[PDB]
């Protein structure tokens, strides 16, 4: 139980670190890829229109 | 005297040697690989990303030895072969 509390606190610290300093850049990368592919699709559509 | 005592002392010394060798090897190998990475980044700033692939390929390799040693260390101290 005591070690369970210790490891739970450790996991809370790990999750805080991840959300603070790891989630933001990864979310940015995912949004960047999604925007890039969306722009590629839209540019293909306008090329077909042209 | 208890023979298991002698066997346990031998196993502890053996595991000490295991991890001593593993530590020396891993520390020096990681230092050398990091020296290569830092020199490459300083000399070729644009290649900063490109170097992170081989570097870890090196790390994951060198540390192997250490960690493998670590495993056998346990086998010596926690599951001493021939302890009887």
């Amino acid at each position: 139980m005591s070690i369970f509390i210790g490891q739970l606190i450790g996991f809370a610290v790990i999750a805080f670190i991840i959300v603070k300093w790891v989630v933001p850049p990864v979310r940015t990368l995912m949004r960047n890829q999604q925007e890039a592919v969306r722009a590629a699709l839209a540019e293909s559509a306008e090329a077909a229109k042209k | 005297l208890d023979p298991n005592a002698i066997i346990t002392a031998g196993a502890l010394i053996g595991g000490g040697l295991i991890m001593g060798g593993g530590a020396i090897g891993a520390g020096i190998g990681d230092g050398i690989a990091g020296n290569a990475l830092i020199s490459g980044i300083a000399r070729q700033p644009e290649a900063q990303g490109r170097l992170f692939t081989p570097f870890f390929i090196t790390v994951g390799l060198v540390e192997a030895a250490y960690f493998i040693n670590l495993a056998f260390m346990a086998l010596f101290v926690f599951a001493t072969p021939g302890l009887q």
Partner: protein
Amino acid sequence: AIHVGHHTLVFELFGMTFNGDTILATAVTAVIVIALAFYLRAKVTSTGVPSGVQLFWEALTIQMRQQIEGSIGMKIAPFVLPLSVTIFVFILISNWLAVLPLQYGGADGAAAELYKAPASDINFVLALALFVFVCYHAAGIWRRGIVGHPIKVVKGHVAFLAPINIVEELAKPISLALRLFGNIFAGGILVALIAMFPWYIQWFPNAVWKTFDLFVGLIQAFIFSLLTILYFSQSMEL
């Protein structure tokens, strides 16, 4: 008290022992991977924007295909792509599930983990290593004949080093297994040691080690996949 090893849920069938804990962890990892795969199959869109799962899967596929193209060429060995990607995802999820907080007091001062990464069990790593071994050796046999392939591997780059060469042929699987095994095995032991401190001190070393172990698992999965691809290429030359 550590009790290194000592798998729980151990049962017997067909005159053979089975580590129930590792079976359960492997099954959970497989279920997670299959859930991700089937979710992707319900979200693959070549027209609209891709979801995060599609992004992750295609990132893995591009990395593995780039390695194959740079090493042996996709046309020669296409199966290497699914093999490497499944190996990578399996190992990665197995090692990363450990981060979840499951260690707890065993009512006698001995830490117990509900989930322990299967790679910490020799059976898992041996299974993956031997499967890869058989796979790329069969690929080499098919590529350059049943009799030519052993000649090619024994001869190596220089015939004089024939006794040396055979060793790597044996060392390739073992190195693949042990390299993984220890890297995950330590993860099991360290936390156990970190369990000896009082709860008000265990959190900091525990947090640091688990943060490092996330990275260790990621790198180990990457190394295993990359070396599998490289061995496949090396056995399918000429």
